[PDB]
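Morning run. Coffee first, then this:
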Amino acid sequence: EVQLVESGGGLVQPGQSLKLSCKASGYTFTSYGMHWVRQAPGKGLEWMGGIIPIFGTANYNPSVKGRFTISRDTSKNTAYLQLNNLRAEDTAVYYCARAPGYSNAYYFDYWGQGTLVTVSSDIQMTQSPSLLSASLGDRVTITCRASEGIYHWLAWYQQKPGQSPKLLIYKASSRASGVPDRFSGSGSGTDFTLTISSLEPEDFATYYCQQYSNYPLTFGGGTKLEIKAAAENLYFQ
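And here it is:
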C-alpha cells in the first residue's frame, strides 16, 4: 500500500525557517509527482506547489513563489517543503500529495495525514452552498463553478474531521477506486455538480472541488454537509 508520511512540523517563531519532509513508500517514487497542499485552521485547501516526474521540475503557487522551495531526493524517496520567513498566515496543516503519472492528471490520489506548523489571474473556484444541512436518505447536489473554461479537469475531495482530503471524483465524472455508487459528478466548461443520491452517516463531511486545467492548481472554498433530523427544517447558505 501507498503511504505518504509528513514530518518536521512544530511551533515556530515569525521570521524563522522550517523544513518539512514527505517520506513515500509502497510505489515507484520516480514515476509520480509530489505536491504540497496546506490548510489554515477552520479553512480551505491551498496548493503550495509540485514536482513533476521525468523532468523533476518544480512549479509553485504565485502566493508562496520565491519564499518556499520544493525539492526531491529519489535515493531517500522523500520530497521537501522548505518554509522561510514564516508568519501568522503560514499557520496550517501541511500535506504532501501524489499526483498520478499522466501529463493531465494533476489531482491527488494519495495524501499523508499532515504536519501542523504553528507560528506564535488564477482560475477562481466558487462553491455553493458554503454550508448545508441535510438528513439520512436524502439526495443532495452541490455546485462548483470555474471563473473560466477548464474542459472537464475537475476533481472532488471528501474531508472528514482530523482527516486529510480523499479523492472522490476526477475528470468531473470518473469515480476514484473504493468510491461508492451514490457519488456522481457531471459537467464540462464552467458548471460542475456533485450528487450524493442517498446520504449515509459517513457522508457528513466537507467537500472541495479542484481544477487541474492550468497552473496554479486551485480549490473551491468548500461545502460543509451537516446532519439534521428528518423532522428538522432544511438549511443552506
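Residues 1-120 form one domain. Good start to the day.
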